[PDB]
Design a protein around this ligand. Structure first.
Ligand SMILES: Nc1cnc(-c2cc(N)nc3[nH]ccc23)cn1
Length: 272
């Protein structure tokens, strides 16, 4: 990772919190192409000082995202590890993450919008699958909206997949259980089972989010009941707009080896 000095970063408003992290809007002062000076809007993702012992996994997450370059993967600009800070500096995405956007625009997101976003996410995951690169935390909170749909010019929405954060292979068990049903059953059994099939399950859960208007699946269940949901081999209810429900359930297969390739997922989406 490129090293960015603290002096070149300005922290502005808080945008929220993640697992052992806090996120801010900020500005990066930099020399850009042709030697021009720029003040660039950035997302600043800060590891909590109390959780400094996760710094390797925290940065390994971003390192994953920058191993490869792709139009549907968030851009990491660098890191700031001056002083006692562990900061990831990322591109600033004006419209934020899809969990919020789906709730706020629930009245005007239709089947075609959801299909286009699902296709784009499946394209990103196919690229990761072809490169045998595990993401490990696919969810609507980690999908960023670069561009809104503009029917007046035909333009579809455009999304990117953000970094997974600290890996489920190192997080406390209680956090993994709270993350059912994004974390697949085999990873609740043994977080070391994380592998490419993990991301097919979580893609199903994310498609359920995209079809459910801001709702979080199983949010009414406490952690014990989420565990028992897996023990009883239940599936998520179909979204009211159920066009993708069979794909959701085929991806959320309790047998990891039976989950379909992202090539097959893409062919299924193109059939609709
Ligand atoms: N790479 C990223 C990631 N998230 C945002 C973002 C934008 C916004 N308008 N509100 C937000 N609220 C929380 C996060 C966020 C921006 N850029």
């Amino acid at each position: 990772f490129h090293k960015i000095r603290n002096e070149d970063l300005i922290f502005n408003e808080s945008l929220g919190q993640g697992t052992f992290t806090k996120i801010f809007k900020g500005v990066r002062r930099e020399v850009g192409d042709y030697g021009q000076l720029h003040e660039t809007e950035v997302l600043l993702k800060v590891l909590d000082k109390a959780h400094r012992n996760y710094s390797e996994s925290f940065f390994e997450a971003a390192s994953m995202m920058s191993k490869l370059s792709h139009k549907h993967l968030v851009l990491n600009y660098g890191v700031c590890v001056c002083g006692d800070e562990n900061i990831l500096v990322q591109e600033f995405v004006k419209f934020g993450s899809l969990d919020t956007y789906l709730k706020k625009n629930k009245n005007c997101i239709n089947i075609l919008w959801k299909l286009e976003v699902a296709k784009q996410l499946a394209a990103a995951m196919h690229f990761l699958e072809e490169n045998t690169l595990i993401h490990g935390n696919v969810c609507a909170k980690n999908i960023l909206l670069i561009r809104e749909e503009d029917r007046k010019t035909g333009n579809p929405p455009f999304i990117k997949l953000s970094d997974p954060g600290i890996s489920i292979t190192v997080l406390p068990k209680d956090i993994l259980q709270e993350r059912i049903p994004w974390v697949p059953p085999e990873c609740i059994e043994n977080p070391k089972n994380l592998n490419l099939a993990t991301d097919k399950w979580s893609f199903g859960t994310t498609l359920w989010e995209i079809c459910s208007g801001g709702d979080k699946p199983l949010s009414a269940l406490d952690s014990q009941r989420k565990l028992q949901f897996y023990e009883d081999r239940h599936q998520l209810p179909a979204p009211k707009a159920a066009e993708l429900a069979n794909l959701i359930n085929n991806c959320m297969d309790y047998e990891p080896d039976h989950r379909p390739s992202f090539r097959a997922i893409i062919r299924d989406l193109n059939s609709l």
